[PDB]
Amino acid sequence: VVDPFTRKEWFDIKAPSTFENRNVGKTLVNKSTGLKSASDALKGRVVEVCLADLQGSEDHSFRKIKLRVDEVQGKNLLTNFHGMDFTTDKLRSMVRKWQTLIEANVTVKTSDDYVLRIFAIAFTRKQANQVKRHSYAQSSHIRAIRKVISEILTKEVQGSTLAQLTSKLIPEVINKEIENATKDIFPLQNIHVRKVKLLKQPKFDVGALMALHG
């Protein structure tokens, strides 16, 4: 005879700057009491919302995002970028037999000091006139492209925080520049940055955290 719902506090999730909408959803914590309140207790959670929910367009239907929540004010708690994932179904259809899969990654920092690892995935496609049923690569091809992906992936990061890094990914600036250096070796196809994880972060810095808010 308790029903914690008669107890639980409510809260609303606010999204960061470079996106379409800042409004996300609701949540449940507890009333804020002396000796383990609702503030410094949790708040640090993350939310997985597809950015097609965040952007609103359906070209972005895959590509999930994790949002870590830093601070809280007045029943309003912001959030920042904890990482990006790929939708399980897309990848699974992205993987087809009769061809070559290619993956590479690199660990890299930024100006506002943040350490992460970005991935990549690509596939070898036939050509308009191509008779043979598979189209694999030469494994010297495969080594070369990773070196190029690595060449290109590192430059884009150390890109002035994750801020400019976040605005880089959304448009797929990366994807195209990959295709650029790539075509001189093998045609391929797809070529998405896939997943990126954040294994380390700097101190709180209340000042710069507010740069995306207003």
Partner 1 sequence: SQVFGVARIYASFNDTFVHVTDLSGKETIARVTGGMKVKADRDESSPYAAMLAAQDVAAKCKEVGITAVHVKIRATGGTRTKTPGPGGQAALRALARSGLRIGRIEDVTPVPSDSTRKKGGRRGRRL
Partner 2 sequence: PKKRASNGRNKKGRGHVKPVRCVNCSKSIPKDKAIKRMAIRNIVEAAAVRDLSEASVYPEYALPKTYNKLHYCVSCAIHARIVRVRSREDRKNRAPP
Contacting residues toward partner 2, per CB under 8 A: 58, 61, 87, 89-90, 92-93
3-state secondary structure of 141: helix
Q: Which does 50 bind (CB under 5 to 8 A by kind): RNA, partner 2, partner 1, none?
A: partner 1
Neighbours of 114 (CB within 10 A): 19
Candidate list 66, 90, 117, 168; residue touching RNA; CB under 7 A: 66
Segment interacting with RNA, rule: CB under 7 A, options 72-80, 111-119, 142-150, 154-162? 142-150
Measure the CA–CA gap between 70 and 78, rounded to whole angstroms: 7
Q: Which does 25 bind (CB under 5 to 8 A by kind): RNA, partner 1, partner 2, none?
A: partner 1
CA atoms within 13 A on the CB side of 76: 9
Q: Tell whether residue 90 is a contact of RNA (CB under 7 A).
A: no
Sheet holding 10-14, edge to edge: 23-28, 10-14, 76-77
Measure the CA–CA gap between 124 and 151, rounded to whole angstroms: 20
Candidate list 17, 19, 38, 52; residue touching partner 1; CB under 8 A: 52
Residue with Cβ nearer RNA (22 or 66): 66
Q: Tell whether residue 46 is a contact of partner 1 (CB under 8 A).
A: yes
